[PDB]
Input
Amino acid sequence: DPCEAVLVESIPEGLDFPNASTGNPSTSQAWLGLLAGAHSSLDIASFYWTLTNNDTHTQEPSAQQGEEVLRQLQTLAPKGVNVRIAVSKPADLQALLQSGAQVRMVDMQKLTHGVLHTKFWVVDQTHFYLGSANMDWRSLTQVKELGVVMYNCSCLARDLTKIFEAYWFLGQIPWPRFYDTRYNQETPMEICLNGTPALAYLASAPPPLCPSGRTPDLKALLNVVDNARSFIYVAVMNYLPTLEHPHRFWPAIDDGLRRATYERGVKVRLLISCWGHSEPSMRAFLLSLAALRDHTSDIQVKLFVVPAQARIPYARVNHNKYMVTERATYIGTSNWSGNYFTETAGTSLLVTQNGRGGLRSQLEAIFLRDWDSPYSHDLDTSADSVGNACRLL
Amino acid sequence: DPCEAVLVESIPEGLDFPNASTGNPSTSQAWLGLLAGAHSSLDIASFYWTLTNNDTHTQEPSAQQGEEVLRQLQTLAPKGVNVRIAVSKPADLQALLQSGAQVRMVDMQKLTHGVLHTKFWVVDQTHFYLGSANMDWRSLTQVKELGVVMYNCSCLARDLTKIFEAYWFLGQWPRFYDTRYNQETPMEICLNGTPALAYLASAPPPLCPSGRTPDLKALLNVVDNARSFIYVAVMNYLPTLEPHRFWPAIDDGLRRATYERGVKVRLLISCWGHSEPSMRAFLLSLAALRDNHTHSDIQVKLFVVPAQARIPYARVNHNKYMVTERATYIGTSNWSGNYFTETAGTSLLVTQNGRGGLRSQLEAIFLRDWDSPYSHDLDTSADSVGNACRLL
Output
C-alpha cells in the first residue's frame, strides 16, 4: 500500500509562523476531504462533541468549519456512510442520530475513573486521522493541534479501528482476540511511507484498554525515550509526575528522561503547554527535570502558550501530544500524567524510519519550529509576558 | 541488659557549637575508656589505619590522641586482649603485629569492586562503637565524626561483632552469620531504661546474610514510615552508582514521602575538596519540590568543617545519620549507589517513643548541626563557606 503520512496542523486563527517553517494542510481541510471522499464508513472516536455554536452556547463565526463538518456529517448518513460514534458520557449527537449516525456514550468514570480523551478518525478503513483534535469547532480553529492523516494506509487504519471498536464496546473491561494487535513495539508494521520503508505501530494508554499484543502507550513512550542516542524532543499538553483526589507520586516518565539524559548524554527537550486550566503542581516537577543541567547531560524545558477568543471555553491551548528522536516518532492523544496511562483512554502512533526527509524529519522540523517559535517561552518567563493565563508558570 | 546508648562525637579542634547544651564524650574519650575497660576481646572493622604522624607523613601534635590509642592498642595485646582487625587492602599495622595484634587485609576491590569503608569497634562483645570515625588521628581530632557507643549492650554488640566477622573472613553466608534483629523484627532493648526497638543493617547485598536487612532497605523503610519529618546528615549523597549509571532509589523515597505524605525532608550533605561535583545538580533536583498547596517540602543544606589544610583528608564532617519523628539511623555508608551495592557499610536503627532517649538526643544533634554556622544553603558562595568546596 502506497501509504502517505501527512502531518496536519490545527492552527488557531491569528497564530502563524512567519518563515513558513513548516507549511502543511489544516485539520479542517483534511477532515472535509476525508468526508467528501468517504463512501463506506467513518469510525470516529472523540472525547466530546461541540461542533455547533449553540452547542457551545457561543456565537462565534469560526464555528462554521465545524458546522460545515457537521453539515457534511449530516450528509454522510443519508449518503450511506456508516457513521458510528463513541463519546465520553458527560445536541449535536441528537442531530446526528436523527440523520441516522449512530452514537454510543461511554461511562469511562464507571469503568476506570477516567475519560475517553482519544481523538481519531478511520475513513473507509483505508485512511485515518489520529491526533489532538477534540471533535469540536474549537479544536479545528481555536486550539493548536497536531495529528497525522495517513492516506492509502489501509493496513494501519484497519488497526486504529481496533482501538475504536473497544470504545464502541464500552459505550454499549473484559480482551477478545478481535482486539489483539500484532503490530506493536516489538514487531511494527513494514510500511512504504512516502516510498521509503518505515516501521510503525499503534499504542493504547490505560492497560484495561490495551488488548494482548497491544503495546501500552507508556511502554512505547518510555522505550522511544530509552532507545534515543542523540536527542529526545517532546511536545505535550500537560506533564505531571502524579496520578492527578488523594496524592500519589508517578515517577515513570521522569525516570526515563533522567536515565536517558544522564547515562546516554541524550539531549532532552520538553515542550509543555500552559493555559488557565493547567494544574500548578506541574511547575515544581518540571523544574526538578530542568535542574539536571550545567559539565559531565542536558534536559531543557519550555512552555508553549497559544496567545475576544478568551470568551470561548477551552479555546487557546496547544493541545499537541507527540515526541521525536534521531530514531523514532511518537504521535499521541494522552497527556503525560499517570492517570492518562492507567485510568483514562488515550492512543499513539510511533513511526521509525532512517535517512533524511520522511515523516520523522517532518515531525522534527515541526518540533523545531514550535520550539523556536515566540509561542515557546522558557520555564521561568515573566507570566504577564506569555500573552495568556500562565497558571503553571 | 542495662543498655546505655551514648552518642559520642569527634569534633575538630576549633569547631564548636553556639547551641551548647549538647555535651557528649569525644570519640577519643569513648575509645580510650573502651580500651582501658577491655579485658577479653576487641574486634574492629576499619577503612584504613593512619594513627601515627609518621604513618601520615605529617608532624602535627594532634596525632597524640591517636598515638595514645596506638600506645593503648600496643598495651592491649600483651595485656591479653584478643585484638583482631579487618582492614581494606590498599606501618601502624606492622607495629600492632609486633605487639601481637592480628591484622587481615580485605581485597574489597577484587571481591565487590569497592572498599571496606566500615568504622566500628566491639569490646568484650559487651560494648560497641558504631559510626564514622576512622582508625585515624584525623578522625579523632581533625574531622567531625558521629557514632553511638552502646555500653552494657551485650546483645547488640554481639551482633555488630558478627558484621566485622564477615569482613574478617573476606580478608583471609553460613548460618553463623544469620541475624534475627532486623527491620521486620528489631530487638527489644531497654535503652537508658526506656524500651526501644533496635536493629543492625549492612550495606552491600553480598555482605548481608539471610535475615540481615540491607542498609538501603532499612534506610528507605525509615524514609517511607515517616509521617512528620525526615532529617538526614550524610557526607556524600549521589543518586548514582558512583560508565555512567543511575541510583534514584533514595531520590524516589524522598520525593514520594514529601508529595504523597506531606513530610518535611531535611538533607544535610557534607562538602569538601573531594566531593564529586555531579552531586550538586542532583541536590538541586530535590530542592525543586517546594510548594504552598501540596505540603511537599524538601530542604537541603551543606555541612562544611572550616594550617590544618596541610593535613591530607582533614577538615570534613564525615557524619552519616538520619532521624524522624519515629526512628533513628546511624550509618557508615555514604548515600551513593556503590555504597549500597559495591562497598561495605553498616548502620544501627533505633525506634523509641516519647520524649528523651536516643531518638531525641540524635534529633537535638541534628538540629544543632542544621542551625550551626557550619550548615550553609545549597547556593552559598564557596568563598564564604570557608573551605575547599567542589559543590559550590
